[PDB]
Design a protein around this nucleic acid. Sequence first.
RNA 1: GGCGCGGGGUACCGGGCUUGGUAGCCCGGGGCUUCGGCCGAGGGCGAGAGCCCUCGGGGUUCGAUUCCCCCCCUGCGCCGC
RNA 2: GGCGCGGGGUACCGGGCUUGGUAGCCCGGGGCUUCGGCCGAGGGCGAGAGCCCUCGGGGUUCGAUUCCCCCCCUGCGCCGC
Lengths: 236, 236
Amino acid sequence: DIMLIILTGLPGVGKSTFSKNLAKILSKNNIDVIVLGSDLIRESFPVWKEKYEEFIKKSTYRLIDSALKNYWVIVDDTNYYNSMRRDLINIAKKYNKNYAIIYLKASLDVLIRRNIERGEKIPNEVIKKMYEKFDEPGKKYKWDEPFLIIDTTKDIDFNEIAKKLIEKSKEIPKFNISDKIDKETRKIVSEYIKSKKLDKDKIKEVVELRKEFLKKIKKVDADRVLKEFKDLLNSY
Amino acid sequence: DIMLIILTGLPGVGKSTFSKNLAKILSKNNIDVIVLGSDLIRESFPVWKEKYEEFIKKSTYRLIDSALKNYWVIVDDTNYYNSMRRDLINIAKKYNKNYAIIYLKASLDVLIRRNIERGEKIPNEVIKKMYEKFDEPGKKYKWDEPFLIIDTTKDIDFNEIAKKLIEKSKEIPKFNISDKIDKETRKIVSEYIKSKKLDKDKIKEVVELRKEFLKKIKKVDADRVLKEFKDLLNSY
RNA sequence: GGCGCGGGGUACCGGGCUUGGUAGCCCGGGGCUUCGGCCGAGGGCGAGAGCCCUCGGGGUUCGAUUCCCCCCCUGCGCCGC
RNA sequence: GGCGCGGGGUACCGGGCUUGGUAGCCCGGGGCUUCGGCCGAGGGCGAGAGCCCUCGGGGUUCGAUUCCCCCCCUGCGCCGC
Ligand SMILES: Nc1ncnc2c1ncn2[C@@H]1O[C@H](COP(=O)(O)OP(=O)(O)OP(=O)(O)O)[C@@H](O)[C@H]1O
Ligand SMILES: Nc1ncnc2c1ncn2[C@@H]1O[C@H](COP(=O)(O)OP(=O)(O)OP(=O)(O)O)[C@@H](O)[C@H]1O
Ligand SMILES: [Mg+2]
Ligand SMILES: [Mg+2]
């Protein structure tokens, strides 16, 4: 009963602290889970250069891809774009494992407060830019729907979230004659019409006649039935 | 000028703190270096089970293997067995990169002190068991020689260690007629001896005669020369 | 640290290869020396020129650098999680 | 969030397929009904039985569920590092 748990949300919301507690409790229920995020590797360098980013991503993924085979992974990343959550979902997909988006939610102002409280190690306007740029889980894709939405300002029940989750892990992942007779009578009708120069009124008649011929048949040998039809019109 | 820097030493010695400072200074010299160790992953789980160890090792290696292609790696592990340092050396080998063992050294008692000071989060007798089990760098293999031996009790010069290192990165990694005539005369001698029933004294003579025939030749046409020899003995 | 393997233990110093004939050849480095070439150490005898003895121990042998068992120096394999 | 694609916008509810003949068939689900079968909504007329009109907007058309342009509902693609 393994599954990829895809946290999501802006910085300051409390993903890491969440992860740790979720992990700890989950593990209290004898479940082997590892917590992975790009920061794990981002912060192994002694400084940040944009060029590290290519490596940090490829590495963090391989990590996740590799771990999921054997363990619950809790992905501790911001995951703001929906392609980001797809990219993760695809690893789960690859191994046919369940997943669970968890949208640690909080209003821009509690976020702005929380950054400030953290010494604004990130320009406040970047929380604000990450806000206006965040893709709401589920707003565009049904696969993207949050399995949960946690309010971080409020107290937080991990016994409950654990319960709910394992329950989820228990799922297996969610990843002619009548035609010929019909479409061939339509054709015969388009001939008789477009050939016998019927007027609108007799048009409607043969049309209804066809619908009524058809009702009788349902109540059966294609060719037989079509001469039958051709005949019916000749008469009428 | 990339290279794998293989720290080594017991727990309590100060590898991680060392790594950080070494990295920081190295990076001050505009060198892209990442610090990797199995603990990076060991401590992403919320608890320790022996079964995690298979995964932690395979993962930590792939990490190192992957990073070395682009960056200096500083391996922050205990690396107590010599096969352990080989296993690392082999990744460097694989990519033809230099390496540098760094033996953060300290006596068992400073180690015992340091553990105690860390609240003996590891049974003192396991530092002591890791001591009696540690393989001294270089004691068995020349490839295993320490490029450096740091004393942790003492102050510590990273400007110097940085200097020394990059200097090291600047290296490119360190990874018949006369016979026939000789061995064929030996044979002719073993015949003449084992056939002409020579006594020990005449044995020595033909032997010396051979060594003297040979000296003349050096001063040349195999077959020619060997009839020449066969002749020389017939006479003598 | 186990258990193993290679090279060396012959002679200017390294490295490699060949060999039951007292060793030999190849590559790199050094030395003496007309020319040709030549070469290390300890002990004994000799004014000297020179001569004897040895080259880690043991055995197969006329003869071991080579084959075999110990051992020392080197270098390396796997593994010791 | 860009730019796109599929399904639906006809009628018991879902899902799929076929089709210029007023729609049809397949699978899953529900309802009424002797038997055979039958079915959704709004408006107008009718005591009633029943009858007229409409099914998002527009055009090619006798005729559009189908072809074409808007739009709404669904579901999805790539990408937005
Ligand atoms: N419920 C809370 N109330 C107040 N402050 C909080 C709360 N949760 C987290 N924080 C603060 O937010 C800061 C970020 O820590 P944490 O790792 O929890 O954040 P995060 O949002 O997961 O980080 P990231 O930017 O990777 O998402 C911490 O300093 C922490 O004190
Ligand atoms: N020079 C030093 N003097 C005193 N204490 C030290 C010194 N260096 C490290 N320590 C202590 O040793 C403890 C271990 O920290 P550190 O990460 O430096 O150790 P470590 O030996 O690298 O860990 P590991 O067990 O992974 O080798 C730390 O709590 C630190 O305070
Ligand atoms: Mg964090
Ligand atoms: Mg440490």
